Design a protein around this ligand. Structure first.
Ligand code: BCL
Ligand code: BCL
Ligand SMILES: CC[C@H]1c2cc3[nH]c4c(c3C)C(=O)[C@H](C(=O)OC)c4c3nc(cc4[nH]c(cc(n2)[C@@H]1C)c(C(C)=O)c4C)[C@@H](C)[C@@H]3CCC(=O)OC/C=C(\C)CCC[C@H](C)CCC[C@H](C)CCCC(C)C
Ligand SMILES: CC[C@H]1c2cc3[nH]c4c(c3C)C(=O)[C@H](C(=O)OC)c4c3nc(cc4[nH]c(cc(n2)[C@@H]1C)c(C(C)=O)c4C)[C@@H](C)[C@@H]3CCC(=O)OC/C=C(\C)CCC[C@H](C)CCC[C@H](C)CCCC(C)C
Ligand SMILES: CC(C)=CCC/C(C)=C/CC/C(C)=C/CC/C(C)=C\CC/C(C)=C/CC/C(C)=C/CC/C(C)=C/CC/C(C)=C/CC1=C(C)C(=O)c2ccccc2C1=O
Ligand SMILES: CCCCCCCCCCCCCCCC(=O)OC[C@H](COP(=O)(O)OCCN)OC(=O)CCCCCCCCCCCCCCC
Ligand SMILES: COC(C)(C)C/C=C/C(C)=C/C=C/C(C)=C/C=C/C(C)=C/C=C\C=C(C)\C=C\C=C(C)\C=C\C=C(C)\C=C\CC(C)(C)OC
Ligand code: HEM
Ligand code: HEM
Ligand code: HEM
Ligand code: HEM
Ligand SMILES: CCCCCCCCO[C@@H]1[C@@H](O)[C@H](O)[C@@H](CO)O[C@H]1O
Ligand SMILES: CCCCCCCCO[C@@H]1[C@@H](O)[C@H](O)[C@@H](CO)O[C@H]1O
Ligand SMILES: CCCCCCCCCCCC[N+](C)(C)[O-]
Ligand SMILES: [Fe+3]
Lengths: 318, 310, 238, 280
């Protein structure tokens, strides 16, 4: 038996926390805190102060616009029957310009709408970025977040904007829809000769799987050393405690090496960021440099060979 | 969603993942739902040829009267047992073609005859009969038509068929999974034969269409992509299964059925047999297979009626 | 050559990767190196707030003798704790010597303090007030009762429970992480140590606060009991 | 060699089974009875993977034989063997190697348990680890059981196993439509996001803009409350991250588990229940 530090068994309250004071040029902090005995069961129960400047608000708006352009379109495609729209919602979507257009700007109903939802979405995204950049300087902190976010954007941008443009065809972009964006994912791999054989696809998986291995590792570790107050990662990095010690040694003894309370967060930051970076690079080269990944892998002696237990005569070869 | 243990079949090499799963329960019900109607006793095959005793016999010419009559008795139960002989005939005038159901039937004797004698690379020696698509119904349950679901298709569509003859009719149809590949004959292939790029124009849209078509085919045969492919290389014929070859000839066979057998009869069929776009109920893989890798589990009905061969 | 661009892009990555690992393996050495018989990175300075101070990493820290003796002279052999295992400060009872200052809130007041000092704090609506419950060691004997509750003023929560020991009426801390509650009886079970052991828990050089130095010594004490609180715990299970 | 603060912890005892027999370190690794059993499973495991490369899919002389790392492959037996032991060169090797992998993995976890007991820390790591072992087990043991044959397991080859995943998913026409699958992916994705968020936050405070002094926990929360009006806090975020990651493994385990044993039709078809609701 032993507390596992999963669920706070006894919580405590104090006047809500309005946060650190911001410097020169930061509007008040709207919203007034509230608590919730249940959020508290698993985390800080204070639900509080949000900051909203020009940027952030200018982001929700544009952001809702794009989401709006997407929906009406979905409503339009099912004939404007909100019963039918609700029934088939999963299969609905707003596709990108057809190939006939290359990069020409087509009429709204012929893709111009996609470009408008794309334009505004990116705009709202590139704005939340800035948002997260302001909020971190006003606090003297560093831009590790905005630089990680900037990493995810690069992949996003590569999917719907950079690759299409380099390829000179908006039709290569991703459609806005739940199941539709799933179908695009599968067809994309089919179109380019199996993405399993794309080396950067392999790297991005390793990094996606590893981000799960890592967080499970760091999270389980820090919890297992919580008894020694290992969660206070802030002072253990400045004033190493037996928590950072019991931790580093659990690993040294397990796998032959270890990190530090601080450095483990660098292994983590980097392992996440490289998931979206190797991804976009992966998509960047697709069709642009390589057209059939499986074949490329064959050219590089990477594809396994199996006893031919099944084969088919090629009719094209009369 | 219940089960253990499922039915399973190994398709490819061990470890390659090419296998098939299915519910035994339902496989047995399906087997029970796809029973063939037993054959009719052989026919006294003596005497003059039908074309010698009758007046407007343009197909079942060289058949004996007996076999001819027999062929008529079988085709009835196969297509319209509730209506009987009178379904495709003008009472009192058996020879008249003054009723669309006779002009169509005549044409459907030629569709089957053709299937069984010229498309063996597909139908092998199992062949087809009226029952194959009809299942005792005047209107095949699984005939299809380009219908508008409650959602709007992509305005884009495979470029017609890459033709301009009798195609003005396809121009009035919006995009639909089958018509552009199993009716018209657009390119299904999109995978490139070269590793590097700069030489393959197939679009992602084209990729999706081929993916869509393929999902239809699989569902129509009640199988998965591994019944014919090795998904690590969809385009590779050497890594595929001999069913892929067969499905290839099937795609042409169905193109020949729809183009020179169903569409031409479009003028003599009533509106009830045409979709909202004026296209006629035509043929697809579902039509014959109805969710089984082989129609009626490959029962061999046709071999009993010589009147169904050229 | 028969070299393609996809190839040369995989080379560049791996080149950045190898370079990355290296950088990361160097930071992995800002603590604990050089080892006891990727190079070491030039020190980095942390500028503590308020009064502050200054920490460098990697730093040179004076060795501290080990209160135990090699069970065996072979290398890689474990050591046996000297004396009464719980007194040792060796093995799970070990701990380093953290600063003799207190962690501070953003304003700069002793962060972790008792509810009788952070005037504001308060138990939560639907949750039993631990204050006044009975503490029971690993075997059952009562140990003492909760005379108070220490909390984090930066991230509002119970970090420690104050414990008035019966056997000596001394006040000792008990980390929440080692305490399990049994509300439907109002107990605070404790697998760490036995009732008797509560007598030797490191004490506070001020009843209104605890230092980084003092927090470790406490937790470490309780932790030691995880292997030294019994002559069977310390042994196998086989 | 030891870290400069490691000796104070290298205590004797804490084992699960064995006692002083293997209670020692080798370089930085702690051994233990489970270090010995584990190493035994691994070695026979690897040594078996080596002889398999030697023999090849057909014969040590065959053209398909290879020592190229990408193409080496040890595959399960045909399905015709059901749950039986298959001849070595017909999937036998794979059967043995699997037992070793399981024995090797389970010991590793059991070895983390002893290491934890020696430090007086929680057993979260070996608990969390057993989730990866469960996923592996479902893929190689449970699923193939519910189906009736060991051949249903994935092959052991760097790329050959990718060939397996591909062909098993497409058996369902469109695997993306597996609802459990959609869940797991969301977890894998969300985790990766949280991880990057956690990483970033700490380094941003322990290392702020020049001139500024090390930041505080209040800042952490003041930032995360600033951006999205909420901050789960130090403790919990480690609690969350572990939840996401373990969940990713769990839903991955069920997603494949339901694919074949409990669902045989294509996956897009499953979604019919939504097109048949009476709401419409
Ligand atoms: C059958 C289809 C193919 C296939 C097709 C693809 C394709 C296509 C791609 C991947 C990609 C990925 N695949 Mg895959 N993949 C397959 C099989 C796998 C398997 C497997 C076990 O079989 C795994 C685990 C992987 C793993 C992965 C990931 C590593 C990678 C995605 C990274 C990511 O973080 O996305 C999540 C991250 C992002 C999208 C970033 C999001 C950023 C923005 C800022 C957020 C915007 C939110 C917005 C504001 C919300 C409002 C929207 C409105 C409501 C409309 N794939 C098969 C082989 N794979 C990607 C890749 O790296 O390819 C090279 C990719 O493009
Ligand atoms: C074309 C086929 C399908 C498809 C087919 C499949 C199939 C089939 C499967 C999945 C599975 C998965 N897919 Mg997929 N999938 C597709 C597209 C995707 C996409 C995408 C972006 O399109 C994504 C993100 C996913 C996502 C995922 C994950 C949810 C999941 C695998 C994670 C896992 O199981 O961890 C769990 C972790 C483990 C199994 C690892 C355990 C590791 C062990 C025990 C220890 C190893 C130690 C080692 C031997 C020692 C090395 C150390 C060195 C010695 C130093 N797939 C396409 C559409 N999907 C798999 C799954 O859910 O499995 C459970 C699965 O079987
Ligand atoms: C490299 C690591 C990964 C990563 C990182 C990452 N993501 C990030 C960040 C980082 C570091 C952020 O800083 C940022 C963030 O979390 O900000 C608080 C973010 C973010 N990642 C997000 C999503 C996301 N990230 C993803 C993936 C990833 N993110 C990678 C795995 C994915 C996928 C596909 O896996 C998604 C879906 C967002 C949560 C957030 C960025 C949001 C943003 O830019 O704002 C745009 C604003 C709007 C669209 C406005 C919405 C506001 C409305 C109030 C709500 C609308 C809902 C509506 C009510 C429905 C009905 C509509 C009505 C009109 C009727
Ligand atoms: C559920 C949470 C996730 C998770 C968690 C997790 N993994 C863990 C832990 C945790 C908490 C550890 O403590 C443990 C660790 O020590 O990490 C450093 C570990 C670990 N996770 C690892 C890998 C790993 N985890 C993965 C995934 C995940 N790990 C999940 C996402 C993956 C994949 C595929 O996504 C991999 C490859 C190892 C680094 C490590 C386990 C170390 C170990 O078990 O060593 C003993 C065994 C050997 C040294 C080798 C034995 C080899 C054989 C006997 C034969 C090999 C046969 C093999 C099955 C075939 C080859 C496989 C082919 C597919 C290529
Ligand atoms: C013969 C002999 C040597 C005996 C030993 C006993 C053994 C090992 C028996 C098993 C059997 C056999 C034969 C094994 C041989 C293997 C050898 C020599 C080593 C083992 C192999 C192994 C599993 C290596 C895994 C390497 C990898 C890539 C792990 C993935 C995770 C990864 C990328 C980690 C880097 C980041 C780190 C260092 C994380 C750990 C970590 C985390 C998560 C923290 O939270 C934390 C918090 C505060 C301080 C430090 C840390 C910390 O270090
Ligand atoms: C066929 C393939 C099989 C191999 C699989 C490869 C997997 C990665 C390697 C696993 C580590 C082995 C043992 C640990 C070290 C040890 O046991 O010994 C100790 C040495 C010496 O450290 P020190 O003396 O400086 O200080 C004393 C402290 N150890 O550690 C090190 O320098 C650190 C090593 C960390 C490297 C991890 C990065 C992994 C790279 C990924 C490779 C490709 C995978 C794809 C991912 C993008
Ligand atoms: C009826 O609807 C109401 C009114 C109720 C509103 C509710 C709306 C609803 C229900 C919306 C639902 C939306 C859903 C489900 C959306 C799902 C979206 C998904 C899954 C998207 C997936 C991927 C998308 C990608 C990768 C797209 C990226 C696009 C980019 C990057 C586009 C960039 C475009 C630019 C920069 C355009 C520049 C324009 C110019 C003209 C300057 O270019 C030259
Ligand atoms: C009912 C049991 C039935 C009979 C009887 C029957 C007879 C019949 C004859 C005698 C002919 C020849 C007419 C002539 O002199 O030219 C003939 C020809 C055709 N039949 Fe028939 N037939 C019966 C039933 C049916 C049914 C149910 C259909 C259609 C599904 C049908 C069709 C046809 C067709 C077509 C011809 C033309 C033959 C040819 O051109 O070769 N009849 N019928
Ligand atoms: C078998 C030799 C055979 C006969 C006979 C036959 C007859 C037939 C008739 C009379 C119609 C018209 C029905 C109407 O009321 O409109 C008709 C129509 C279709 N058929 Fe036919 N048919 C025979 C065989 C086959 C086979 C093997 C197929 C499938 C490849 C097939 C298909 C169709 C389709 C499609 C139509 C149009 C739908 C409709 O008009 O009902 N038939 N059949
Ligand atoms: C599974 C749902 C499935 C998929 C996916 C699939 C895809 C696929 C592609 C992408 C192609 C084109 C390859 C190229 O570009 O060269 C292709 C072609 C053929 N397929 Fe298909 N296929 C799936 C399923 C099946 C099944 C079940 C069969 C067998 C009945 C089958 C058959 C074929 C055939 C034949 C072709 C060749 C088409 C032509 O040459 O015109 N596929 N498939
Ligand atoms: C539709 C485009 C279509 C496809 C695809 C298709 C495929 C197909 C295959 C792969 C087989 C062989 C199955 C196996 O060997 O296990 C097969 C067999 C038969 N088919 Fe079919 N087929 C398609 C369409 C049609 C249509 C429209 C008909 C009806 C006229 C039809 C019929 C048959 C018959 C009969 C067989 C049996 C052949 C045999 O080997 O016994 N098919 N088809
Ligand atoms: C061959 C080139 C190898 C590239 C080296 C990779 C190490 C990148 O690591 C970067 C540093 O370079 C950067 O200055 C710091 C500051 O926070 O952030 C680190 O994450
Ligand atoms: C994450 C683990 C993946 C390990 C990558 C395996 C790469 C194998 O390395 C291959 C060798 O096996 C091959 O024979 C030679 C010579 O042409 O080329 C090398 O690149
Ligand atoms: C995950 C694969 C490892 C499990 C192997 C199980 C083998 C069981 C063999 C029992 C049947 C015996 N025999 C002689 C018929 O093979
Ligand atoms: Fe952390």
């Amino acid at each position: 038996p032993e507390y596992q530090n999963i669920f706070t068994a006894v919580q405590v309250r104090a006047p809500a926390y309005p946060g650190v004071p911001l410097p020169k040029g930061n509007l008040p902090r709207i919203g007034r805190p509230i608590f919730s005995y249940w959020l508290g069961k698993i985390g800080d129960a204070q639900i509080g102060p949000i900051y909203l400047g020009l940027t952030g608000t200018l982001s929700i708006f544009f952001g809702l616009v794009a989401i709006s352009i997407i929906g009406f379109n979905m409503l339009a495609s099912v004939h404007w029957d909100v019963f039918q729209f609700l029934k088939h919602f999963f299969w609905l979507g707003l596709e990108p310009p057809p190939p006939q257009y290359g990069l020409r700007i087509p009429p709204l109903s012929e893709g111009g709408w996609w470009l408008i939802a794309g334009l505004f979405l990116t705009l709202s995204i590139l704005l939340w970025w800035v948002r997260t950049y302001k909020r971190a300087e006003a606090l003297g902190m560093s831009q590790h977040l905005s630089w990680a976010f900037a990493a995810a954007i690069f992949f996003y941008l590569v999917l719907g904007f950079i690759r299409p443009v380099m390829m000179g065809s908006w039709a290569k972009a991703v459609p806005f829809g739940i199941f539709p964006h799933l179908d695009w994912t599968a067809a994309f791999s089919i179109r380019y000769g199996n993405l399993y054989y794309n080396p950067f696809h392999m790297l991005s998986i390793a990094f996606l799987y590893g981000s799960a291995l890592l967080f499970a590792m760091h999270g389980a570790t820090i919890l297992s050393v919580s008894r020694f107050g290992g969660d206070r990662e802030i002072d253990q990095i400045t004033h190493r405690g037996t928590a950072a010690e019991g931790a580093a040694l659990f690993w040294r003894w397990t796998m032959g090496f270890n990190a530090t309370m601080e450095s483990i967060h660098r292994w983590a930051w980097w392992c996440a960021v490289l998931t979206v970076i190797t991804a976009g690079i992966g998509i960047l080269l697709s069709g642009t440099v390589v057209d059939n990944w499986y074949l490329w892998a064959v050219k590089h002696g990477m594809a396994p060979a199996y006893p031919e237990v099944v084969t088919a005569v090629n009719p094209y070869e009369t | 969603c219940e089960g253990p243990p499922p039915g399973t079949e190994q398709i490819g090499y061990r470890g390659v993942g090419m296998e098939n799963y299915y519910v035994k329960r339902q496989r047995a019900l399906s087997i029970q739902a796809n029973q063939p109607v037993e054959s009719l006793p052989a026919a006294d095959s003596t005497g003059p040829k039908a074309s010698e005793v009758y007046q407007s016999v343009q197909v079942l010419k060289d058949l004996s009267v007996g076999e001819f009559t027999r062929t008529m008795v079988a085709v009835t139960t196969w297509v319209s047992p509730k209506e009987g002989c009178n379904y495709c005939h003008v009472p009192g005038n058996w020879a008249s073609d003054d009723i669309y159901t006779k002009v169509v039937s005549r044409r459907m004797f030629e569709l089957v005859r053709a299937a069984n004698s010229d498309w063996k690379a597909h139908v092998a020696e199992t062949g087809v009969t009226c029952y194959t698509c009809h299942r005792g119904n005047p209107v095949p349950k699984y005939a299809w038509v380009t219908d508008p679901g409650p959602k709007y298709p992509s305005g884009l569509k495979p470029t017609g068929q890459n033709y301009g003859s009798k195609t003005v009719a396809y121009a009035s149809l919006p995009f639909d999974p089958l018509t552009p590949f199993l009716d018209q004959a657009n390119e299904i292939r999109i995978t490139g034969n070269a590793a590097l790029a700069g030489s393959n124009p197939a679009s992602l849209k084209q990729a999706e269409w081929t993916f869509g078509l393929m999902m239809n085919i699989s569902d129509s045969l009640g199988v998965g992509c591994t019944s014919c492919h090795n998904t690590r290389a969809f385009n590779d014929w050497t890594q595929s299964t001999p069913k892929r070859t067969t499905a290839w000839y099937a795609i042409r066979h169905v193109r020949d059925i729809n183009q020179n057998y169903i569409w031409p009869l479009n003028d003599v069929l009533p509106a009830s047999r045409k979709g909202p776009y004026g296209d006629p109920l035509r043929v697809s893989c579902m039509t014959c297979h109805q969710a089984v890798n082989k129609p009626l589990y490959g029962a061999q009905m046709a071999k009993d009626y010589p009147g169904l061969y050229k | 050559h028969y070299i393609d661009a996809a190839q040369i892009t995989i080379w560049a990555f791996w080149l950045f990767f190898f370079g990355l690992i290296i950088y990361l393996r160097r930071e992995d050495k800002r603590e604990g190196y050089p080892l006891d018989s990727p190079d070491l990175p030039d020190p980095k300075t942390f500028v503590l707030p308020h009064n502050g101070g200054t920490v460098v990493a990697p730093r040179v820290e004076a060795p501290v003798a080990v209160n135990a003796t090699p069970f065996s002279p072979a290398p890689g052999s474990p050591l046996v704790p000297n004396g009464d295992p719980m007194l040792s400060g060796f093995g799970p009872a070990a701990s380093p010597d953290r600063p003799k200052h207190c962690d501070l809130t953003f304003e700069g007041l002793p962060k972790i303090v008792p509810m009788r000092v952070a005037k504001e704090f308060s138990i939560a609506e639907g949750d039993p007030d631990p204050r006044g419950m009975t503490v029971v060691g690993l075997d059952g004997e009562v140990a003492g009762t909760v005379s108070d509750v220490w909390v984090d003023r930066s991230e509002p929560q119970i970090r420690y429970l104050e414990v008035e020991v019966a056997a000596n009426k001394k006040k000792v801390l008990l980390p929440i992480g080692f305490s399990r509650f049994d509300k439907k009886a109002r107990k605070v079970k404790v697998d760490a140590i036995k009732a008797a052991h509560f007598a030797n828990v490191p004490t506070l050089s001020n009843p209104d606060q605890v230092t980084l130095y003092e927090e470790d010594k406490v937790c470490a004490y309780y932790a030691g009991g995880k292997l030294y609180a019994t002559a069977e715990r310390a042994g196998p299970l086989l | 060699a030891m870290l400069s603060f490691e000796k104070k912890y290298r205590v004797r005892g804490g084992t699960l089974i064995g006692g002083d027999l293997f209670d020692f370190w080798v370089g930085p690794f702690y051994v233990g009875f489970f270090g010995v059993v584990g190493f035994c499973f691994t070695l026979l495991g690897v040594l078996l993977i080596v002889w398999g490369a030697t023999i090849g899919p057909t014969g040590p002389t065959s053209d398909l034989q290879t020592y190229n790392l990408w193409r080496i492959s040890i595959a399960p037996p045909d399905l015709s063997y059901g749950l039986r032991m298959a001849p070595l060169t017909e999937g036998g090797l794979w059967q043995i190697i699997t037992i070793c992998a399981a024995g090797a993995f389970i010991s590793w976890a059991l070895r983390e348990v002893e290491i934890c007991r020696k430090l007086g820390i929680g057993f979260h790591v070996p608990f969390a680890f057993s989730f990866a072992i469960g996923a592996y087990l479902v893929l190689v043991f449970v699923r193939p059981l519910l189906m009736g044959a060991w051949g249903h397991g994935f092959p052991y080859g760097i790329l050959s196993h990718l060939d397996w995943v591909s062909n098993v998913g497409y058996q369902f026409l469109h695997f993306h439509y597996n609802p459990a699958h959609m869940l797991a992916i969301s977890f894998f994705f969300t985790n990766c996001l949280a991880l990057s968020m956690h990483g970033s936050l700490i380094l941003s405070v322990t290392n702020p803009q020049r001139g500024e002094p090390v930041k505080t926990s209040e800042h952490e929360n003041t930032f995360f409350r600033d951006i999205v009006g909420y901050s789960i806090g130090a403790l919990a975020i480690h609690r969350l991250g572990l939840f996401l990651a373990l969940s990713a493994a769990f839903w991955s385990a069920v997603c494949i588990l339901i694919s074949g044993p409990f669902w045989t039709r294509g996956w897009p078809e499953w979604w019919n229940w939504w097109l048949e609701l009476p709401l419409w």
